Amino acid sequence: SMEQVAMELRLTELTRLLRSVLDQLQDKDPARIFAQPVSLKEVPDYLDHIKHPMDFATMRKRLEAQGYKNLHEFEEDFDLIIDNCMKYNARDTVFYRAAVRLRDQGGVVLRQARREVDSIG
Numbered sequence: 345s346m347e348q349v350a351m352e353l354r355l356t357e358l359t360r361l362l363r364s365v366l367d368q369l370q371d372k373d374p375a376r377i378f379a380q381p382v383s384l385k386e387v388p389d390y391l392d393h394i395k396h397p398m399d400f401a402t403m404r405k406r407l408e409a410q411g412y413k414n415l416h417e418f419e420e421d422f423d424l425i426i427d428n429c430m431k432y433n434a435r436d437t438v439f440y441r442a443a444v445r446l447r448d449q450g451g452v453v454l455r456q457a458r459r460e461v462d463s464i465g
Contacts, residue, residue, distance in 0.1 A: 355413070361457065361464075365454070377439060393431070393432050398424035398425045
């Protein structure tokens with residue numbers, strides 16, 4: 345149907361906007377602390393601590409299969425990145441501090457992305 349096509353076009357345009365949002369958020373992590381999944385080889389107990397692991401590469405895989413239906417979904421995954429890190433790692437660590445900075449800086453980007461996703465529908 346033409347309706348299904350139009351919905352697909354909206355999903356594709358969301359996907360384009362989210363790809364740019366993701367690049368901007370990832371630039372707020374120049375150390376690349378959140379680039380890849382936490383390794384179970386190097387933190388074998390990780391899944392006893394954190395129930396839903398997340399990282400930028402896993403987000404990117406989901407994005408390229410057009411797997412985010414809305415911004416809410418994508419923000420949930422970004423928040424998991426930050427929130428997981430702040431629970432697993434102590435306050436006095438390079439990891440925790442990197443999450444705080446990503447949260448603070450990413451907040452700016454997400455504030456306007458919410459307006460762009462509303463605004464362009």
